[PDB]
């Protein structure tokens, strides 16, 4: 395994924050569509994580209570 470049520390930081926006948004949008001012709860996050296939790696991290 080689080292880890700055360009990578950068890219990694940059896409993780895009994913925070993605998971949040996706979770809300799948619950309240576009309706504004709604309250996002844990159920909504475990709901999209159980739905979206690209989120299956989070099935054990965000399980359904």
């Amino acid at each position: 395994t080689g080292l880890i470049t700055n360009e990578v520390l950068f890219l990694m930081t940059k896409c993780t924050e895009l994913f925070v926006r993605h998971l949040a948004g996706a979770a809300y949008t799948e619950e309240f569509g576009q309706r504004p001012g709604e309250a996002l709860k844990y159920e909504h996050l475990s709901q999209v994580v159980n739905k979206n296939k690209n989120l299956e790696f989070l099935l054990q991290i965000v399980p359904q209570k």
Binding site: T5, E7, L11, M12, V20, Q34, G37, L45, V49, L58
Partner: protein, 83 residues
């Protein structure tokens, strides 16, 4: 954390996120980084590279079904390299 704003930035006007939702999103983002790192290693490994590159991560992203991400990260890399 800074995740509080990233969140309320991704959400519509007047939306709120419970402390559990945010916590969950935080853990989720953490597993994401580890997972993308891990996968980028494998792709960088199958792509011969000894070192993970900006294109090994962008390829993993898209190969991991987050192709939406790519265009901005590329726009960012391009601007990042000049500075």
């Amino acid at each position: 954390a800074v995740i509080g704003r990233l969140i309320k930035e991704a959400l519509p006007e007047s939306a709120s996120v419970s402390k559990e939702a945010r916590a969950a999103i935080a853990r989720a983002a953490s597993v994401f980084a580890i997972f993308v790192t891990s996968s980028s290693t494998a792709l960088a490994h199958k792509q011969n590279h000894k070192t993970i590159t900006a294109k090994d991560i962008l390829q993993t992203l898209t190969e991991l079904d987050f192709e939406s991400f790519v265009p901005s990260l590329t726009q960012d890399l391009e601007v990042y390299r000049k500075v």
